[PDB]
Ligand binder design. Structure first.
Ligand SMILES: CC(C)(COP(=O)(O)OP(=O)(O)OC[C@H]1O[C@@H](n2cnc3c(N)ncnc32)[C@H](O)[C@@H]1OP(=O)(O)O)[C@@H](O)C(=O)NCCC(=O)NCCS
Ligand SMILES: CC(C)(COP(=O)(O)OP(=O)(O)OC[C@H]1O[C@@H](n2cnc3c(N)ncnc32)[C@H](O)[C@@H]1OP(=O)(O)O)[C@@H](O)C(=O)NCCC(=O)NCCS
Lengths: 185, 188
């Protein structure tokens, strides 16, 4: 079920139709940085996420920094029998790269999934050509499970592999510690 | 790619669209084959079939019944469609014990992979199975599918126990060799 997460200036809130135009304008202003994503420039990428929420398939979130939209992220691919899910669909405007915002986002969402949803597995995947995203994920301590061939298209249509990672509930203390270590340097 | 229902045929072997009327016989046969189905989640649960039939309405799965001489002998399905690529999974496969090692699996996979790669023009077909299920692993390896890795805490076994998944796939560039190896095992 839907949730709103916050930590200081950062707020993760359910995505609504009213957010779509500002997200698309921001993505297009940041198009260079978003080349590894599928279609961040398309309104229907955001609306399909809102529709997926209706069908219980996704929880799309808008990232606000001091009340300003700076990007998006989402829970998806729920496996209720386990329970397990994915954090995916993440992007931030360039000026937030390196600022610790991703780490705060991942901490809030991962804490929710493990502590509140009692997940046994949270997975994350990224393009094999997207080295900065791989490093961000590796910094979490997520375990690299393998390379999935022909598993995504990049923004300009090119086929790429995906790298798949996960974190188990057993591993959560480890990951929580590493994120909290970053908060405080 | 359009996820439309199809019948696939080879000799006396037919893969036919699964329908509601089939579910009781499937569940009855799975119950008679409990011992061989212990690594799957829910082959003995009618809802596992019903759910795929429902998902087909929305384009998200194509469940199939395996008939040999018009006799139900097991099941398999296409699922996890990725339309942008396009890509899919072959999963939910089981046969009654009496058909293990009798060549039906290779025929079924040839038919499904041919549809996926030649008609749907897929770039990726994936297959996955429990880390505990070594017979399935060896049968997927015999196809030539490439082992991509182990997914932790990713499934439950029939009785409820958490296990890992081994994930494999076949790409469009690998299909020609997969197809030819399968045909090297067939007559004509
Ligand atoms: C950048 C983004 C992933 C969010 O994270 P972020 O704040 O940049 O993350 P980080 O700050 O930890 O930076 C990532 C790292 O990449 C490093 N980096 C990695 N590969 C590099 C390379 N080839 N060249 C130069 N620098 C590289 C950077 O030094 C940095 O790591 P560091 O802290 O060790 O110095 C994301 O918004 C993005 O902009 N677009 C695509 C999103 C995506 O990939 N989604 C996949 C599914 S969610
Ligand atoms: C998965 C399945 C369709 C494979 O069909 P099959 O006809 O049994 O496949 P094969 O006999 O060609 O291959 C299995 C291989 O593993 C061998 N094998 C059998 N038991 C084994 C075991 N515990 N450990 C390792 N290998 C084993 C078989 O001898 C054979 O190898 P070989 O032909 O080289 O000698 C069938 O076994 C089945 O329905 N199993 C129960 C349902 C199931 O588990 N499905 C998994 C869904 S992912």
């Amino acid at each position: 079920l839907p949730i709103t997460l916050q930590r200081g200036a950062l707020r993760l809130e359910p995505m609504v139709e009213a957010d779509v135009p500002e997200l698309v304008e921001l993505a297009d202003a940041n198009r260079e940085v978003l080349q590894y994503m599928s279609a961040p420039q398309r309104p229907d990428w955001y609306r399909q996420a809102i529709a997926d929420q209706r069908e219980g398939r996704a929880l799309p979130l808008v990232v606000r920094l001091g009340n300003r939209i700076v990007g998006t992220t989402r829970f998806l691919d729920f496996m209720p029998a386990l329970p397990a899910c994915e954090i995916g669909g993440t992007w931030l405007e360039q000026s937030q790269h390196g600022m610790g915002l991703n780490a705060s986002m991942k901490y809030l969402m991962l804490r929710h999934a493990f502590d509140s949803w009692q997940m046994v597995r949270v997975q994350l995947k990224t393009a094999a050509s997207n080295l900065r995203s791989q490093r961000a994920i590796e910094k979490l301590g997520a375990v690299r499970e393998g390379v999935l061939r022909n598993h995504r298209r990049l923004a300009g249509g090119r086929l790429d592999d995906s790298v798949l990672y996960s974190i188990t509930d057993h591993e959560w203390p480890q990951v929580k510690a590493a994120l909290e270590a970053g908060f405080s340097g």
